[model samples]
Target: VNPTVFFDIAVDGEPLGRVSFELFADKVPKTAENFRALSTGEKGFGYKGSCFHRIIPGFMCQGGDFTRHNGTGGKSIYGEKFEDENFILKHTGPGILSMANAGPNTNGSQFFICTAKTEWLDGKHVVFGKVKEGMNIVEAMERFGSRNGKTSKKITIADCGQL
Candidate 1:
């Protein structure tokens, strides 16, 4: 099944909205499971309370370094890193959910929600899901971003879980 998940976000400590997504389990089951488990926090560490450390307007909003809260620290249920799975999916447009890795096969818990088409990332990042709804919330966060990828305001994933 294509399991759905959600992230209840907040901006400057106030509730923004929920960004729900449907994991592409059929195409990328392993990658989908990584995101699903992290959302549920069954592994003791997950995406909840993590701030979007990096945000770029007309691009994507990045986060999930729950370990360090910056873009440097992250851990998957498998370990600190995992395989790229495959570049079977593409970041063709907005709402494409992909693993944000340092290079190749270095995906941890870190990820980004694309607010615009990022065709350049298609072959590099593993795209395994898409926003089932809540593009408006993603767009709202983009407006609050800085030019250098860091967020100007505290945009956070206040809560997250399978839904």
Candidate 2:
């Protein structure tokens, strides 16, 4: 099995638990590498203090825009957006981690976690990983943002490292 990356998340200064995801390196090498580097801070950047900027109960939760923290700012490890890997991996179920972009070949640091099946996003987003554990926290976050549509609880990534 491939090694997994674990992200310890917190809400409102309390521990919400961790989410672990496995990478599809062979399928999306650049996309996976960029995500791995950012998650591990191997390139002086990571998703440590980011929050869930966009959330939909029956859809997905979007975040990872560490720069502006509002879904407007983020850059790839390359310091600029890159072309899509367009991997075969699909957003077939919940807890999927995929790249967010303005358009094709515009992938950056932003990503989203699916709370439910999003087949409509299959070919549009580059899926690099999927949550392997602690999905309850993701669901909790989903519920927490269903009202305001964006989480104010501050979902801080206390730690993000390879496991």
Candidate 3:
């Protein structure tokens, strides 16, 4: 089933706006579950204001590094197991949402949207969802990478919600 989820992000919760996503639970069940948990406020009370942090034009925009002030702080949780013995999730295509991880089986609260079609990431990173709306924001962020061309932008997630 196509699970549609909605969200509203704003800095300091002033100028609130909405965003929609189409979750791919069939493709990445664990990643989808974690994403839903965070988005629905099941956890991550401090996720807001977490910077997209790392980005590259015509490629993939990265975030959830928490080690740095704007990063996901290098946090890692045991990633869900693959359904098969050797099958793995890889990053592929634009708007392909995947979990940010440290080493194998270590995924956490950070993710990224592709700026270009990336087939290289396939099976290596879990593709949990796609942007049904507000992709312009993703595109914009892709180009607005690392404000000074060194550090990433300050675009925080702000908040998320259900449709």
Candidate 4:
């Protein structure tokens, strides 16, 4: 099933907009469930206060590292690293949502939304979802970080729920 999830993003406590994701639960169950739980706070910790710690203009915006607030810390609700689903899906176009990791089988809460075709990440990250709407805001968030590289903006997912 393709479950839809919504994320309300804000900048510096001010409401920016919302981005919707259509999760490929059928194709990538494990990865999608991890994200679904984290987004809904069903596991006690969620993406409500997480920041997009990394953003690369014309590339992707990375976030979901709720623990460290940086790119270093985050975990699945399972409490340990899980194996990668690595479905046949690829980063074929923009607005793709995929897990972020250091190497193989390290999937966790961290994920990235591609702003453009990122073919290099085709087989590297688990592509679990895709941006269904609000990509303009995603681009705006990208601009926010690209303007002053490395100055991570506080992009909080104020609320996330299944729709």
In terms of TM-score, the best-performing candidate is 1
lDDT of predicted model 1: 0.92
**For each candidate, what TM-score against the reference?**
0.97, 0.93, 0.74, 0.94
lDDT score for residue 128 of model 3: 76
| Top-down TM-score ranking | 1, 4, 2, 3
- In model 3, the number of clashes is 19
Task: Kindly report which residue pairs in candidate 4 clash with one another.
Answer: none
Arrange candidates by lDDT, descending. 1, 4, 2, 3
Candidate 3 structure quality by residue, lDDT tens digits, 61-85: 6665544644436443333322221
For model 3, where is the 10-residue window of minimal lDDT?
78-87
> What does candidate 2's lDDT look like per residue over 23-108, in tens digits?
88878888988888888888888887777778878888888888998888999988689998776998989988999999889999
For residue 86, model 3's alpha carbon misses the true position, in angstroms, by 8.7
Model 2 sits at a Cα RMSD from the real structure of 1.4
Task: Select the stronger candidate by lDDT from 1 and 3.
Answer: 1
Query: Model 2's lDDT to the true fold?
Result: 0.84
Clashes of 4: 0
Candidate 4, which segments miss by more than 4 Å at Cα?
Answer: 147-149
Of models 1 and 2, which has the larger TM-score? 1
lDDT of each: 0.92, 0.84, 0.60, 0.86
Pairs of colliding residues, candidate 1:
none
Q: Evaluated with lDDT, which candidate comes out highest?
A: 1
Against the true structure, candidate 4 has what lDDT?
0.86
